[PDB]
């Protein structure tokens, strides 16, 4: 009963809050999808376009265009794959890596401002909540 | 330490929303198209210009999203951003149903995960859900 309502409310809250945090790309010529691909590439390291498409759950034609756009802006490099495949490996450039870190700082600074409008008790609840939510994604199959 | 609360909470919400996103049923819409559709369904009819502002995408990108959604029959029309500037776009019945279907999939998966926690932990998440909505000024 209130089980259903907690799943509804918590899902809503995390989607709505994350929506705002995704919007914390400092203005920049990269889209939401481009930044997401870049972030994955930066955090997980060099990979092929096919693997990246899979990691993002986007189909290869769409991801190949994202990659091309990121490369054009110099945010991702391309190198031939060692071991003749013959695939390409894509990785973040230093401007790409810096962009991902800049975006993360931006989310953090934005969030801190919002959290400051709450009292200490509320922030304490969100601390426990943050730990639990992190555990939930860790523990998911 | 409130510094680390901004860091951890952001990380948690980015990762969890990522998992919930992945539970959206397979569909012919991209993430950006779904977002526009969802906004349109939950907040109501708007002009293409208003939808673009709401989605924080540049008007040319939004015109193609709107056009694509009309093509798929998920919105009633796709007015030209100049010639139709003052025309309202709304979700169709199939579009609204897509949005509701996605919403159910996310919450049902989440309910399964929440069931692995104890009552005290769920109490915390219950309070946190309200607080997080308040953070984005989206309280009732």
């Amino acid at each position: 009963d209130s089980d259903a309502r907690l799943a509804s409310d918590l899902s809503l809250a995390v989607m709505r809050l994350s929506r705002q945090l995704r919007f914390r790309n400092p203005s920049s010529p990269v889209s939401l999808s481009q930044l997401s691909a870049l972030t994955t590439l930066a955090n997980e390291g060099a990979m092929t376009p096919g693997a990246l498409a899979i990691r993002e759950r986007v189909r290869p034609p769409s991801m190949t265009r994202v990659i091309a756009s990121l490369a054009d802006m110099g945010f991702v490099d391309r190198a031939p794959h060692p071991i003749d495949g013959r695939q390409v490996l894509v990785s973040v450039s230093e401007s790409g890596a810096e962009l991902v870190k800049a975006a993360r700082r931006a989310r953090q600074e934005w969030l801190a401002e919002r959290l400051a409008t709450l009292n200490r008790s509320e922030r304490d609840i969100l601390r426990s909540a943050a730990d639990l939510m992190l555990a939930l994604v860790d523990e998911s199959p």
Side-chain angles (χ1 to χ4, degrees), chain A residues 18-109:
Chain A
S18 61
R19 180 177 181 268
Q20 295 292 327
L21 292 169
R22 292 178 183 267
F23 285 160
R24 286 304 113 187
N25 187 331
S27 91
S28 197
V30 299
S31 73
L32 216 72
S33 59
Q34 292 170 338
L35 179 58
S36 175
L38 205 57
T39 299
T40 291
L41 217 49
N43 293 342
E44 296 177 12
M47 67 190 79
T48 67
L52 183 55
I54 292 172
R55 287 294 295 157
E56 289 295 288
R57 283 194 176 54
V58 171
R59 275 209 80 201
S62 180
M63 182 50 65
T64 53
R65 205 93 100 181
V66 170
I67 288 169
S69 297
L70 287 168
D72 284 3
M73 293 181 279
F75 290 132
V76 299
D77 298 320
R78 284 194 191 89
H81 197 282
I83 294 162
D84 165 284
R86 180 52 61 88
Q87 315 61 11
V88 339
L89 289 178
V90 297
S91 59
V92 293
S93 67
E94 258 166 24
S95 61
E98 171 62 27
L99 189 49
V100 174
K101 291 180 206 181
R104 177 183 165 270
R105 287 187 294 269
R107 290 191 296 270
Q108 239 157 130
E109 298 172 347

Side-chain angles (χ1 to χ4, degrees), chain A residues 3-23:
Chain A
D3 281 352
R5 180 189 168 200
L6 172 63
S8 182
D9 289 341
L10 183 58
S11 180
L12 178 65
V14 50
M15 297 303 295
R16 295 299 299 180
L17 183 46
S18 61
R19 180 177 181 268
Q20 295 292 327
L21 292 169
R22 292 178 183 267
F23 285 160

Side-chain angles (χ1 to χ4, degrees), chain A residues 92-135:
Chain A
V92 293
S93 67
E94 258 166 24
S95 61
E98 171 62 27
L99 189 49
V100 174
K101 291 180 206 181
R104 177 183 165 270
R105 287 187 294 269
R107 290 191 296 270
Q108 239 157 130
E109 298 172 347
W110 181 90
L111 192 49
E113 183 180 5
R114 297 304 181 97
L115 291 171
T117 70
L118 306 180
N119 62 59
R120 173 179 178 181
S121 298
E122 293 169 327
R123 284 189 292 271
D124 284 346
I125 282 165
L126 290 176
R127 164 62 58 184
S128 299
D131 290 339
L132 285 168
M133 281 185 294
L134 286 170

